[PDB]
Amino acid sequence: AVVGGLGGYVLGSAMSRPIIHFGSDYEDRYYRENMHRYPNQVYYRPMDEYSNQNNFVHDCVNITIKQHTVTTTTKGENFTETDVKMMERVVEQMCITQYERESQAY
Amino acid sequence: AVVGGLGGYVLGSAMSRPIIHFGSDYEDRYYRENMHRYPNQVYYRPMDEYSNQNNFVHDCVNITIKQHTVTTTTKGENFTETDVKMMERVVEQMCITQYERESQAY
Ligand SMILES: [Cl-]
Ligand SMILES: [Cl-]
Numbered sequence A, B: 001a002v003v004g005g006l007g008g009y010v011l012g013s014a015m016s017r018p019i020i021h022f023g024s025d026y027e028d029r030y031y032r033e034n035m036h037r038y039p040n041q042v043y044y045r046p047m048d049e050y051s052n053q054n055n056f057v058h059d060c061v062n063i064t065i066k067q068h069t070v071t072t073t074t075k076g077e078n079f080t081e082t083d084v085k086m087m088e089r090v091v092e093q094m095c096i097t098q099y100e101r102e103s104q105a106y
Helices: A025-037 A053-070 A081-104 B025-037 B053-070 B081-104
Strands: A072-074 B072-074
Touching: A025 B025, A025 B081, A053 B081, A081 B025, A081 B053
Parallel strands: none
Antiparallel strands: A072 B072
16 A cells, blocks of 8 residues: 655654644543554655755655555554444444344344 | 354344434544444344344344454545544654654764
8 A cells, every 4th residue: 555656755763653732622632542543653755855844844744644544454453442432332222223123024 | 354253144234323422522522523433234143043132232233343343444544534633733743853853864
């Protein structure tokens, strides 16, 4: 799963994901709980090619996220405690409905 | 991607994911925003095999979630507006760090 025109991009080394503080309590908790689903390294082009930080960082952010997006994974890889708790509730309701579907039609 | 011992399980038809109301504002919003990452149909065994709803629903919930978990997808398939906003912020910080890594060592 390689995004187009990745040639001449280099993958840097892992780093620690920044801890960010958004105002909202939702964003803060969401970020803690989900930050591991995001990249911990970026793609970039050689410095000998840039005139400033801004351009460097434009290509790096764009391509890093595109590339991270095309990457395959299992749905289960992504889920968290929260997802898990939430599927158990909704999948239970749905199985009760399937049950009713089966009793009525049977 | 088939979980073991799926034989004799049947996949029911899609339904509308229930809308659930948890007390917490986090859970409620999280669920709206994420409910589409969860199944909209379940696996189950023939009714002629059960003595009650509870057993039917035990197998159905367990296997449906296991099976949903092993299912492949792209990381980008999973992301939402929120994930996207969040990656743009963290991937920007990281690209700034990679930048500093490159300026110092260069
Ligand atoms: Cl590096
Ligand atoms: Cl059905």
